[model samples]
Target chain A: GAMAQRMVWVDLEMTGLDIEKDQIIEMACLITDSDLNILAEGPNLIITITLQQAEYEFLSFVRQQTPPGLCPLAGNSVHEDKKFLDKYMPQFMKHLHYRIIDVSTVKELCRRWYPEEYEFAPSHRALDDISESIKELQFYRNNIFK
Target chain B: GAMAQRMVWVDLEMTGLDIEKDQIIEMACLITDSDLNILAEGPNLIIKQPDELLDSMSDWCKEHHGKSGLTKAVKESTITLQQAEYEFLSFVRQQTPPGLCPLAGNSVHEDKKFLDKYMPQFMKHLHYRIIDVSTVKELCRRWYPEEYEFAPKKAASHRALDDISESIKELQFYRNNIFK
Candidate 1:
């Protein structure tokens, strides 16, 4: 079915790299339209109380924004974040359609496009990753995605 | 004792990629001195068996290098793993020089891992360090990007002796040909 929706940018703070070994510590989702208009922003939510509590809150939080249509996801190294979402927060993830846009790929392709201009910096926190990745997505949309 | 003054170019054509689950189909080596002079060509041989070839490699290698053709060649040569080990060890004993020489080749681990499994003696006889071709190629590609303007001399894939022999051109160039 066809409907208008936003891209939900997710960034996860985790214990370690191994999906088999690690658990998600904190997570956040920022919602925006395709052209980067802010729709709704999920709070910088920490895994507190029990996982059951976190999952119960997130299911409502994510679905409220997404409504019915497919809300795409973007991340800096979306593959890792997607894994965390799949394993850790299945309640929220099951609602949104799984369309991942890895901003790392965008950054790489942007380097080919910009070459001299596509310098990189790191954000050591969750929403900062989403924020940083959106900056890259903006560069990609302006240059490569055009 | 710490650093190997001499080098040995080594290669193993394996039936599959994993050291855990494959046989070494062939083995070859070229010993070289500090100045990159070819001290000895080999104790090269085809270690033939009916083990499974890596499907990804076999079809590509068969189309271009013909892994099946090489398998046929191995069968005709009638060399086995035991014979290869004996020839390889006996040759090294006669040389009577360095107990360890730096292993040289592209992705040297693949060969070294196989050696560690099949002939642990061979690995113990060699230096701890590896003069990896891909490492040199990457350093060159990053620093001397202009060198790749010409066609890269490609390998036919999975021929042991030929690979070790041919790597000299690259190793020589990377090692600065004359001296350090």
Candidate 2:
């Protein structure tokens, strides 16, 4: 008999914010099954950027502040993210097909489940944020949805 | 000398998440134009459900959300969203002798979210996510009520495509009043 596949959580960092205006700088996905067991992981999907001098300085700041292995994708918007990848990395885009469990949604779930810690910072970076999202999903499965 | 026009923006709330599982519970529209001035508004239209759970909705609740003044059209309008979009594209292609550029708001997000779930060719179309008046107001409001006085006898019934048709009507009205 067929079993339900586990949900995957994804977090992305982009060069800019508008899905239409900017592109992805970096992205990470943590795959887990129904039981919250880790299946596969993708992290630090990097892209090169054509930066201005000031932008390069900003990038240096980002590099210093951000953890090792996490980098920006490119483009400032979601539309730009798709456009840039379609133009540059079509193959990678084609291979990736997984349901996204957004961190914000998970935080909402956390408010309902772990009310005490719901107010804490969600750590908006890619891997840590996504891991927290996964934990939220797992918590839901174990506590509420079960 | 010019054509009398119509346009509308339609929204739908469905019974179930999946298109297959869901039936339309609520349909509403803000009829506007190319420049996005409201011509006429459709009532937050409701279609009676077949089952309590399946079509589960309350008339009172729907009435509370109704936009008022717009008449009920027909429940079984027969046109689907895909059909309407195709027909609309054909009409635009034929009418705009110079050529037409399709645009939308949040086209990228909409494409990613709706492509496989709705239409596979969505991205190829000139769909965009522009900030139009209909999107901003959430409901239609007429500036010249007498000129655009054509409201339905009964409120337009609830269905996904029908709401879209109403939205197109609103869009046309906006074009006639503001753009023309």
Candidate 3:
């Protein structure tokens, strides 16, 4: 398999999961190679600091690092983030590939089958959660891809 | 890890992805225990709708449904949307515990959106958390490119029951080979 395309992993700490009602509190983005090696990342943008400004900065940061719509949005339960982006930041939403890499789904497989050894506790912070999700997927790749 | 709870796996073939503009043409429901063992089956329904509504669908849906014979079956069917909902709700309530079953399938969030709009009662009966099989498939594509080649091939029939059956088989493949 080719190890060229990068993955754009974004995690958001939202007020809640209801896209219509809740708001994003913080967002963190990571640019990584296919091997999950982090090449670049952004500081957690606290939304209250700049609701509109954060979106602008985030998009600028993304464009500087990777081409728009090239990378699939990768993270845990990324569908929820996609919904929020569609509502709040439609431009950034369109800038991403339509596909997503949701580690939570794989975590669900582990929880149901293994049940005991793979329990993962999410810290809920944007960057912390992203790191944990990547680490979790790496663990699965190491064992299952062997 | 208790194996008592059931899963409500539903697949709906609609005019389009839009809940506002589109209509459900066919629906199939399956009740399965946590182990993926079939407990009971459908009130599989082809909902009756006007020709205009069906024709108004996007070209992709029209072409796909036309090939699958869903469009013709829907126009010929006798079941109303209201009857479909009632029968679906009855089957769910009879087969599984209320609010305990998680909706399981590939990319089920889209299906749930339609259910929320069309079958609110049936949507409310299932648990909020969805068991999305696509997530694990995504992981397999990224991590185990070679082994991922063994993933179940879908007929891509776009029919309700066959789609649900493929989703179940895909998950079973992951459980047996990928996650094991």
Highest-DockQ candidate:
3
Model 2: per-residue Cα lDDT over B92-130, one tens digit each: 333322212223221223223333344333323333322
User: What does candidate 1's lDDT look like per residue over B13-102, in tens digits?
Assistant: 776654455687778877777556777787768776652453445554445435436667655667777778878867665553456565
What's the lDDT for residue A75 in model 2? 15
Worst 10 residues of 1 chain B by lDDT: B135-144
In order, the Cα lDDT scores of the candidates are 0.62, 0.38, 0.76
After TM-score superposition, the amount by which residue B22's alpha carbon in candidate 3 deviates from its true location, in angstroms, is 3.0
Which of the CAPRI classes, incorrect, acceptable, medium or high, describes model 3? acceptable
TM-score (all chains, Cα) for each model: 0.50, 0.34, 0.83
DockQ of candidate 1, scored on C-alphas against the true complex (2 decimals): 0.03
CA deviation > 4 Å runs, candidate 2 = A1-4, A48-99, A109-125, B1-158, B161-180
Q: What's the residue-level lDDT of A82 in candidate 2? A: 41
C-alpha DockQ for predicted model 3 = 0.39
